[PDB]
A paper describes a structure:
Poliovirus is a small (~30nm) non-enveloped, positive sense, single-stranded RNA virus. The icosahedral capsid of the virus, which is made of four proteins, namely VP1, VP2, VP3, and VP4, encloses the viral genome. For enteroviruses such as poliovirus, genome delivery involves a program of conformational changes that include expansion of the particle and externalization of two normally internal peptides, VP4 and the VP1 N-terminus, which then insert into the cell membrane, triggering endocytosis and the creation of pores that facilitate the transfer of the viral RNA genome across the endosomal membrane. Structurally, receptor binding results in an icosahedral expansion of the capsid by 4%, yielding a 135S, or A- particle.
One method involved the binding of virus by the poliovirus receptor at the cell surface at 37°C in a natural infection; the second involved incubation of virus with the soluble ectodomain of the receptor at 37°C; and the third involved heating 160S particles at 50°C in the presence of divalent cations that stabilize the meta-stable 135S intermediate. Receptor-triggered and heat-triggered 135S structures (designated "r135" and "h135", respectively) were solved at 3.2 Å resolution (after density-based masking and sharpening). As expected, the capsids of both r135 and h135 were expanded by 4%, with holes at the 2-fold axes, were full of RNA, and failed to show well-ordered native-like VP4 pentamers lying flat on the inner surface of the capsid. The r135 and h135 structures were qualitatively similar. Surprisingly, both r135 and h135 maps lacked a visible extension of the VP1 N-terminus through the quasi-3-fold hole, which was supposed to be the structural hallmark of these particles. In both cases, residue 69 was the first ordered residue of VP1; residues 43–53 of the bottom loop of VP2 (which supports the VP1 N-terminus) were disordered; and the quasi-3-fold hole was partially blocked by the GH loop of VP3. Thus in the r135 and h135 structures, where the 135S particles had been prepared by protocols that were believed to result in both expansion and externalization of the VP1 N-terminus, icosahedrally averaged maps showed that the VP3 GH loop was in a conformation that blocked the hole at the quasi-3-fold axes and there was no detectable density for the VP1 N-terminus. As in native virus, the center of the cup (near the 5-fold axis) contacts the VP3 beta tube; but further from the 5-fold axis, unlike native virus, the density is seen to curve away from the capsid (as if it were peeling off of the inner surface of the capsid). Moreover, an unmistakable gradual curving of the VP4 layer away from the capsid, peeling off of the inner surface, was seen in the r135 and h135 structures that is remarkably similar in appearance to the density that has been ascribed to RNA in previous studies with other enteroviruses.
Author numbering:
A (entry chain 1), B (entry chain 1): 69 to 213, 234 to 281
C (entry chain 2), D (entry chain 2), E (entry chain 2): 13 to 43, 52 to 134, 143 to 159, 174 to 264
F (entry chain 3): 61 to 231
Write the structure that this text describes.
Amino acid sequence: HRSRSESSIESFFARGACVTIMTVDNPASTTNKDKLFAVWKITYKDTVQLRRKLEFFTYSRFDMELTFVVTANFTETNNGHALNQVYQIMYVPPGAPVPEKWDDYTWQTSSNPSIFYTYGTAPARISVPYVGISNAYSHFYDGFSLNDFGILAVRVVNDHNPTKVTSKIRVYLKPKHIRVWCPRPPRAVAYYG
Amino acid sequence: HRSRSESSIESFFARGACVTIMTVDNPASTTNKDKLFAVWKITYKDTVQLRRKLEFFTYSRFDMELTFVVTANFTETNNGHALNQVYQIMYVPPGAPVPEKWDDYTWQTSSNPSIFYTYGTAPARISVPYVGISNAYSHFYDGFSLNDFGILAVRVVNDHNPTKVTSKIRVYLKPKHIRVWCPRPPRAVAYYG
Amino acid sequence: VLQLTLGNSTITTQEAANSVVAYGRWPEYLRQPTEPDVAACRFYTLDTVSWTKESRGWWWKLPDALRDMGLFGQNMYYHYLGRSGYTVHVQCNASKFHQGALGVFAVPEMCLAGTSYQNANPGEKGGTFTGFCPVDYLLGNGTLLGNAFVFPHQIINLRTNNCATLVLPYVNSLSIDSMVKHNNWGIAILPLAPLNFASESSPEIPITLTIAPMCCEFNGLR
Amino acid sequence: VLQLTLGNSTITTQEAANSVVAYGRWPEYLRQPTEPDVAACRFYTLDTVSWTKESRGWWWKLPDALRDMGLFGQNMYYHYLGRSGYTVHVQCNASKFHQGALGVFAVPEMCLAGTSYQNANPGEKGGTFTGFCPVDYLLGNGTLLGNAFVFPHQIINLRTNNCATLVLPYVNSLSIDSMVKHNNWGIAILPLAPLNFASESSPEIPITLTIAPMCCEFNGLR
Amino acid sequence: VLQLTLGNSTITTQEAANSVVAYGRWPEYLRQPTEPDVAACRFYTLDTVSWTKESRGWWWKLPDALRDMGLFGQNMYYHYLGRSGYTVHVQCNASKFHQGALGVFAVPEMCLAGTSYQNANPGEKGGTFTGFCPVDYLLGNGTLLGNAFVFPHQIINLRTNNCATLVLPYVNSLSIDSMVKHNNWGIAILPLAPLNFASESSPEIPITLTIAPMCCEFNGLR
Amino acid sequence: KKNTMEMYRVRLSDKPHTDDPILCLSLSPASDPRLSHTMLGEILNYYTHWAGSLKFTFLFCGSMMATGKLLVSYAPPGADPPKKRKEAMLGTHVIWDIGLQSSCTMVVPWISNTTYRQTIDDSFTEGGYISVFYQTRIVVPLSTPREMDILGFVSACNDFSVRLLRDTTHI
């Protein structure tokens, strides 16, 4: 058993993994639809690698070190110039109300922590702790009335912009301090798409 | 023997040396070919200085402190403007599958470590450790069925760009903690081109 | 022949040698609720099932099996929260001339799939796999069955031992929970090697489950 | 006159004074496999070669030379992995009136070049350099031959000593390896100063290699 | 169930209770030759034979049986002289409903008769008696078979024990001898009571010989 | 048989007794399709390198009355697999008497030049060949079904380890 570490649960799970690509737009007054802000309920059940790894086991606890990689681009060739934008990356915790408009009350709310990421700087980062009501995240639950990790909402803070600027935000979830319980037969790659 | 250090194996080998110039393009929707991403199997067998130095000896171990110097430029005179790009510099370890498309599954894979280098910042850097299956890299191997250090893949993360932006990435390999074994007659500079 | 007893119940075990404790943790009370260990902790022997050649498997949920079962079933309705470990004796009494094997798999959170409560909760009669009815070699979820042997389990190979015993601790995300809603454990008995027997012998051997709820404790009684 | 012995073999050495150990490391067992030091560790004397005036050099690989050589050759086929050091006595017995010199170079990983297995592996007869056949003063790879004296080596200068001895330890990236595939060592004998002799003397002196595999150990026998 | 081992071989014995040592002398090395007790001393299990109702008997010579058997067969060809004791396990695995008996007779100098080498030496397949083929109740030489029980022997009576074990020391006029020429021992298995079985049971039970050469030692290797 | 219950059972009839083995399982634990899908193989599909030993276990799921002998051979790396019972016997083997012990374990050992082995080799079968032959055809009493089934299990031993994670799961 030569230093079995590499297959330890930490080494196994704790890896940066893109879980979503959230696209937002600049509040240009031309015809911009409700794409002015993006919303995404934190969930592993869309990414297959992390899902398949977690579903080896029945229960789990883990902190969550989300990292945000924002990249923008002018939409049309009317580039000209446009000042460095700022992005509000709000992490709506569990059970809290999610935004609905660009400038809903939720964006100013004290509760919801928020990053103000300036473009062209180092990637933003928060560390959500274990936000479970249970003492462990249940991946399989034979019972009656899924777990909540929160929502991530993203918008451009700037307002009166002449040129449209699309921007994609890659969320890089790295589960941290994982503990897991009750191994299981791994589901097959076949049935995830 | 006045402080023979300067000819020690560390002092001899451990020097920054450009091993490749990888060229990538911006994902402009005009006619951009599969140059959208660049791939390069890490290998000293192309650079002559480092090759000739290593082939003094038969076997070796060394960590590898790659450094990346990215430099871009607008292709045509339709410059106008374009926002600061971000580059994904993925280091595919040995035995892992190499990317084939711009957005292959490999780019999101947890295994492959990846840098997200923003333009106009300090040069990116990783330190690959010794990734040999053997207990030493063999430069000459009289035997039947070359060693693997990995692949470096590079792409621009931005998507809807109006202007094309070429970009070259200089990889500056600096072998670190070198140990070598079994000296040999040095090959002549003559037969490398 | 070890004759076991729990109050007003008694069982005839061969001997408790091949007894598997799931996850090496014996059932324990919580280290706050009442503990009706008076008479609810007894052997509830379910209605036997007949293993023919064509059988694909059987399954029960726990404690949904013991829902109409006397005091435990009562406790588990008139209290709001409860937790219970179990001792599942699967006795499968056959002659020396029958042959086959059974994999007895205790499954945490055995969410099956072919959805509704009455459908996912067969009670005391249990359900059966099929080649609704989940897929046998999947346990509903698209699993390869060999991998199933990660679960706390035991083989009943008719040539050798003819009975298994699984001691299940309380497995749940929570310290205590509503039993009427949520089945912690799940038992699946699948025939690994199919039944076969000599020419005019008994053509369907029986299988009997005996479930002693260990270390049960409930709160709060309405 | 030192008469050396290894089981069912015996050798007549002048005396083991001018004996070069390669890289100052004596062959050692690994500090897990079997060690057939019983009878495989003996002197295997290859078929002598004739050094005429026109000779450019000779070469053998190790252990490809000792592939058809009895127990070592057997061990080295029916096991999967092995490792072996060697003792190469190059005796070159000539009169007092012949003159010349031989550079005997033990070469780690002696990849030669003018490519295929049968071609890179001559066996017991060995191969020969040429001015395929690799270039003598290159050893195939485009080397200047003087530089060759970095290799573990010994000169056989006929005026003085007429025999060399090279004690080779196991050199490889791995601790143990398949011998059928991969030749760790390589011996090249090149005439530094060409042969010459008095008028009607013996016009071609012989050269004889005696290879004792030291500290050999193999795994796993099929 | 005693699981015996000799290097790269393993055997599943019931238990070594009914084990007959021939002439009360355990195999011993000679109180001068080499002793390859390294790997030649292992279990060589011959090709099973089917005992039908009509069978009259079987026989093997020793060490002619173990002539193509790996290292012992090698040793016994490339050396000139050798001697070896043996351990012959005759396992005869049948159900509880077969009946019969086998006399297993180890015979010194078992010169049979109905003459030539290939004829008197069947190798690993063995030969068979008949009512050429020697006479069963004679063992070729005009013997009454009951008297055969002077030989070192053991009965395999299917109702009771289903396997015999014979530990044979080296019996010969000489201290050591050529094994390629001269078979010291001889094994004859004759069915004393004929096979019979219930109506539609297995109509031919198998018999398996496992021969461990004990205390073998050889001289001189060519 | 695949993707059913039947793909795990090896049937032992008393049909014409041929020397070719009951089964021969190559131990390329991730490359061999059979061992690829075991939990061992599942975890090894997540790693570039591995080392250590593998315990196999064969379980007889036939009649309590049945008797006979199966020879469980293990050819080491490089060795082409045995084709006949004798070849297998001369190598490493275990004679397994069905009557006496109803299961049979065998810990294949660790043998490799490198400290580890790749899980996607150069398309080159090496190492294991776990063969199972009949030494004796199976004996059964009265009207007992001559067709039995044996199951096969596999697990990494304690010494086993992996390294250099390699996620490949994708859509």
